[PDB]
């Protein structure tokens, strides 16, 4: 079962995100945001590059990850607009670093929940709120509040025991975090 | 943007020549009902005639040519 990454249901404007392209279309295309529970976005043909293009499949490449910046977000109707043309290479390194650390935290906690054998979207939301979202809101860092948390809690049990989630599941998650992040 | 532009309903008065690269669109002389003095020219796409009402999302743009 899959769950969303951060507590924001939709990203804010001018935010970088690692996007997998799903299918090419006529007026635009159809894509999927990895770190927002696979919601359908859109990239435009005019938002590909500033220069002239001679092959639409040379830079789109459906089936490949791409870094895009959010342009317009409409939470009322679920409309997401993306832009690859405005993406600068300076934030790109921080982008896949944040994406990799968030996906490793999500993979570790999903493995812990699969060991715990709980198959419900609300159950994953509640356990991941008890595990990561609380300390993410405490440290005030989107994405940066999990990798440093497990790095500081791999050698310190008192830092990891501050969350009042459970006892046996908390010990299983602490053992899974200490086994991987070593 | 921070601007919720009110929509305008406007009524055509005459049909000008058909612009565009392949002639897909045509030019009309259109006028409003809330103020029946202001008349602007708009590029409209589709089968039009004399008497149909057009829904203009903005009323401050003047019709560009084919290019």
């Amino acid at each position: 079962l899959s769950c969303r990454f951060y507590q924001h249901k939709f990203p804010e404007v001018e935010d970088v995100v690692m996007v997998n392209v799903r299918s090419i279309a006529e007026m635009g295309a159809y894509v999927s945001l990895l770190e927002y529970n696979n919601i359908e976005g859109m990239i435009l043909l005019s938002e590909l590059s500033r220069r002239r293009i001679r092959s639409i499949n040379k830079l789109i490449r459906i089936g490949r990850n791409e870094c895009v910046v959010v342009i317009r977000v409409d939470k009322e109707k679920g409309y997401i607009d993306l832009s690859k043309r405005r993406v600068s290479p300076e934030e790109a390194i921080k982008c896949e670093d944040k994406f990799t650390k968030s996906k490793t935290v999500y993979s570790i906690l999903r493995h812990v929940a699969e060991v715990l054998e709980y198959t419900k979207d609300e159950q994953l939301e509640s356990l991941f709120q008890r595990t990561a979202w609380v300390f993410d809101d405490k440290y005030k860092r989107p994405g940066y509040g999990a990798y440093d948390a497990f790095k500081h809690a791999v050698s310190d049990p008192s830092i990891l025991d501050s969350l009042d989630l459970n006892e046996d599941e908390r010990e299983v998650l602490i053992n899974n975090i200490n086994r991987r992040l070593t | 943007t921070s601007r919720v532009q009110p929509i305008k309903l406007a009524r055509v008065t005459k049909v000008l020549g058909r612009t565009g690269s392949q002639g897909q669109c045509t030019q009309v002389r259109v006028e409003f009902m809330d103020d029946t003095s202001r008349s602007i020219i708009r590029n409209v796409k589709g089968p039009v005639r004399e008497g149909d009402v057009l829904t203009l999302l903005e009323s401050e743009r003047e019709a560009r040519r084919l290019r």
């Binding site: 899959s2 799903r22 999927s32 696979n38 | -």
Partner: protein
Amino acid sequence: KVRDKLNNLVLFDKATYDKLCKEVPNYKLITPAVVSERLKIRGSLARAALQELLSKGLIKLVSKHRAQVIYTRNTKG
């Protein structure tokens, strides 16, 4: 992009029968396709169950066709 491979059961067990008996007569629009989608059952089983409740008098028939049948609930009062 979730697959979620379907396994539509052929014969009714203990629990799906009485959830059907408590939920299907409280539905505004009753169709074999939509009750097979809601209860994750096979289409012939849905047709047999709606025919059984039609014979039981808890289901009001509206229109009958070779492509679909349309059923509706009864009045509460």
